Amino acid sequence: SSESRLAALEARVTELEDLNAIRRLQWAYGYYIDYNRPEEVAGLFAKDGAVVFLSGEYVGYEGVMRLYGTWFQNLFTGGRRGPVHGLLLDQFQLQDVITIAPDGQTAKGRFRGILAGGWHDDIVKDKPEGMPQQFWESGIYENDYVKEDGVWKIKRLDYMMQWQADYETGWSKTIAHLQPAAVCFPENPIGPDRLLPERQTWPHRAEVPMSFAHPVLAKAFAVGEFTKLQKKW
Amino acid sequence: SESRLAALEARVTELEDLNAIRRLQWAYGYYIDYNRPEEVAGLFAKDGAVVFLSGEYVGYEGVMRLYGTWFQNLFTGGRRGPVHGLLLDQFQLQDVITIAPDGQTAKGRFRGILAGGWHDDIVKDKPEGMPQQFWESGIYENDYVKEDGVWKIKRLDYMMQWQADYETGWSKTIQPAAVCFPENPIGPDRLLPETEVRQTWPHRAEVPMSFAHPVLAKAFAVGEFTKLQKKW
Amino acid sequence: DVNASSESRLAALEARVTELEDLNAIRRLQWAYGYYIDYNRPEEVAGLFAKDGAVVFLSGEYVGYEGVMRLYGTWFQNLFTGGRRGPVHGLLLDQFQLQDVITIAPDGQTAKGRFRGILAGGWHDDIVKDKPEGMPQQFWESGIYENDYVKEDGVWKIKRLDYMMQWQADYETGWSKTIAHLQPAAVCFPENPIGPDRLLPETEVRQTWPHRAEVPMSFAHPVLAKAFAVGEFTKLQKKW
Numbered sequence: 119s120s121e122s123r124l125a126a127l128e129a130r131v132t133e134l135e136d137l138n139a140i141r142r143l144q145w146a147y148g149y150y151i152d153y154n155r156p157e158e159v160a161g162l163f164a165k166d167g168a169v170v171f172l173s174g175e176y177v178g179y180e181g182v183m184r185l186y187g188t189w190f191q192n193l194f195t196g197g198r199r200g201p202v203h204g205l206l207l208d209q210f211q212l213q214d215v216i217t218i219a220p221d222g223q224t225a226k227g228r229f230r231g232i233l234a235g236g237w238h239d240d241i242v243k244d245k246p247e248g249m250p251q252q253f254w255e256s257g258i259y260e261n262d263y264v265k266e267d268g269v270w271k272i273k274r275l276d277y278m279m280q281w282q283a284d285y286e287t288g289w290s291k292t293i294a295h296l297q298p299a300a301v302c303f304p305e306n307p308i309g310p311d312r313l314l315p316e317r318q319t320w321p322h323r324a325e326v327p328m329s330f331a332h333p334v335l336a337k338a339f340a341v342g343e344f345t346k347l348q349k350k351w
Numbered sequence: 352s353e354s355r356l357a358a359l360e361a362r363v364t365e366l367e368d369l370n371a372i373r374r375l376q377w378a379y380g381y382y383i384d385y386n387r388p389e390e391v392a393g394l395f396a397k398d399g400a401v402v403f404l405s406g407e408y409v410g411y412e413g414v415m416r417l418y419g420t421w422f423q424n425l426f427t428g429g430r431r432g433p434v435h436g437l438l439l440d441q442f443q444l445q446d447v448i449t450i451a452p453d454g455q456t457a458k459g460r461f462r463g464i465l466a467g468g469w470h471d472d473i474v475k476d477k478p479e480g481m482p483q484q485f486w487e488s489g490i491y492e493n494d495y496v497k498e499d500g501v502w503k504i505k506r507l508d509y510m511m512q513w514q515a516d517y518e519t520g521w522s523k524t525i526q527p528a529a530v531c532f533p534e535n536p537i538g539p540d541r542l543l544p545e546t547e548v549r550q551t552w553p554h555r556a557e558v559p560m561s562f563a564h565p566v567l568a569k570a571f572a573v574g575e576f577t578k579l580q581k582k583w
Numbered sequence: 584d585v586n587a588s589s590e591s592r593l594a595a596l597e598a599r600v601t602e603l604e605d606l607n608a609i610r611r612l613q614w615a616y617g618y619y620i621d622y623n624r625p626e627e628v629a630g631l632f633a634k635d636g637a638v639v640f641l642s643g644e645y646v647g648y649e650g651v652m653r654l655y656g657t658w659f660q661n662l663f664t665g666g667r668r669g670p671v672h673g674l675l676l677d678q679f680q681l682q683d684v685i686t687i688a689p690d691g692q693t694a695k696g697r698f699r700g701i702l703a704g705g706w707h708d709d710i711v712k713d714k715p716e717g718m719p720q721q722f723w724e725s726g727i728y729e730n731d732y733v734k735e736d737g738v739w740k741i742k743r744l745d746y747m748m749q750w751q752a753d754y755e756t757g758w759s760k761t762i763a764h765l766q767p768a769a770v771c772f773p774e775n776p777i778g779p780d781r782l783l784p785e786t787e788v789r790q791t792w793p794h795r796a797e798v799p800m801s802f803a804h805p806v807l808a809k810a811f812a813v814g815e816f817t818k819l820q821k822k823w
């Protein structure tokens with residue numbers, strides 16, 4: 119009942135540091151992607167970590183460099199570390215809800231991003247056909263983390279786009295586009311390492327289940343009890 | 352050593368308390384974006400209240416009536432969301448939380464920015480007089496209680512600051528007293544005093560800060576600094 | 584560590600808790616800063632600063648209470664509200680604050696922090712008669728902060744507030760349509776009543792969106808730290 123108190127405090131302070139460290143991975147991730155810097159992004163990942171993009175997984179430093187570098191950086195900046203003249207890709211990061219597992223060796227986190235993106239008139243000659251010149255996009259992250267040798271790293275980065283808009287017309291006017299199945303790397307040089315089982319896009323919606331327990335009611339939370347209090351109108 | 356331990360334990364409790372109160376607001380946001388009124392109501396103390404457009408919605412009943420009977424019916428036709436073509440993302444940010452000296456209540460300032468709308472696929476279901484797609488921002492100055500060791504929302508006070516049709520923007524935007532529940536099926540339980548009534552954008556009104564000046568505290572006096580400012 | 588003394592363990596916990604409180608206090612200065620500037624309240628802003636602190640605006644420094652009152656009061660408050668503490672009818676200047684990455688120095692007495700803002704700004708049609716010529720009626724703007732902090736007598740204060748605008752847009756036309764405007768060097772106060780106390784070197788002059796320039800990260804790589812080397816990862820990237 120002094121050793122017990124110290125050990126219990128040490129655990130509590132470790133969890134507070136764990137939360138800060140995991141939130142920092144996401145906030146840093148954002149500052150690196152805004153500048154199309156895939157190297158810093160890949161270094162955030164456990165070597166067996168993955169990024170989920172278009173219903174596949176891009177695995178390890180190779181997969182992360184392929185997605186953010188071979189695909190995105192070539193597409194957006196012509197294969198230059200950013201930022202560069204006339205290219206905006208700000209993915210503002212916010213609203214972290216992080217859950218450390220009981221053993222303190224893994225964690226989950228919900229986050230979200232809002233992207234303001236575009237090719238300025240000065241560089242729109244370099245914009246790929248079929249991309250809007252300036253756009254908004256938002257999505258939800260439900261990510262996994264691992265603590266390796268005392269350091270938190272990204273184990274799974276799963277960004278689920280919720281909506282997109284052309285700046286000029288807004289989210290209400292976006293045309294649905296049917297998403298074909300990806301071909302994997304290596305046959306597809308920018309493809310995923312592997313496919314997920316069985317997402318079509320805005321205006322279609324699908325819940326992203328919360329990784330976090332109800333913060334007041336926890337496992338006792340029952341929807342139906344509360345639904346009884348609502349009426350038709 | 353007992354004095355030192357107890358003082359450390361208190362400091363760690365306050366750090367946990369700040370995280371727990373911020374979590375209520377961030378979770379609140381993820382639930383409201385999905386028109387999930389049950390999860391929202393469960394965040395509240397049983398004697399909690401929501402202040403919306405100068406009325407109070409009291410307890411689980413008031414909270415279910417505001418977010419369920421009114422908003423969920425309005426936006427999704429009375430379905431837990433998210434649903435096809437309906438956007439109601441209220442991004443939550445910029446927490447400044449003050450735990451009371453006794454550690455049993457707290458205040459927090461927060462803010463939200465809402466991207467909202469009916470996609471062309473579902474605008475047939477949009478009520479008349481609502482814009483198809485809009486931005487809105489507002490400020491929260493909330494109250495919290497720690498009940499049986501658990502932080503809960505005591506008073507959620509959201510004050511809308513501006514709204515814009517997506518197409519025209521906030522500069523180009525163009526309000527009766529509420530009728531209470533139950534005569535108004537979606538009304539508040541009670542009205543705020545006229546003195547606390549807010550008119551909307553372009554009309555503005557300060558939302559006083561719940562937090563002390565973070566550097567000067569009680570010593571902060573505006574007039575001392577105003578002396579240094581000139582006309583231009 | 585079951586082999587460490589209880590004293591060493593206590594002291595090490597006390598240091599750890601102090602660092603966690605330091606991070607919260609520094610983030611609070613930026614979040615509070617934002618709520619004060621959104622209301623055009625220069626006095627509360629000035630009080631956040633060390634007395635020898637500065638704000639970097641357009642390649643100059645505004646130094647101490649005087650400089651901070653001059654930038655936010657004499658210049659900005661006069662420009663936006665006609666010299667009234669806000670908020671006021673029809674005037675929007677919301678600079679949403681987010682995405683803190685804060686690094687406390689080893690000695691615990693200084694700190695750096697990266698942050699960013701996104702501004703939704705404008706004059707409502709009701710007050711646009713009072714808008715200065717050459718300013719858009721409604722606009723977006725975003726910028727990056729790389730700030731310095733000092734802990735004075737156990738209180739964290741802003742030592743250097745360095746806001747670097749990254750982009751701006753007229754609401755109607757968007758960031759892709761913004762016209763580059765060549766930015767002349769500032770004239771200092773006092774010859775310029777709203778000017779900086781001193782200029783930064785030409786080498787620190789920034790031209791504006793669509794021109795871009797990195798704002799180096801104040802933080803180490805959060806996983807690899809000083810071991811992070813770009814070239815090792817660049818080897819894994821191919822042409823496409």
Ligand SMILES: COc1cc([C@@H](O)[C@@H](CO)c2ccc(O)c(OC)c2)ccc1O
Pocket residue numbers: 383401402403422425439441463465467481487489509511
């Ligand atoms: C009180 O809690 C909140 C309420 C809001 C509403 O302003 C939003 C979304 O419910 C709204 C926007 C446009 C409307 O026409 C509308 O009509 C009822 C409601 C936003 C944030 C809150 O926390």
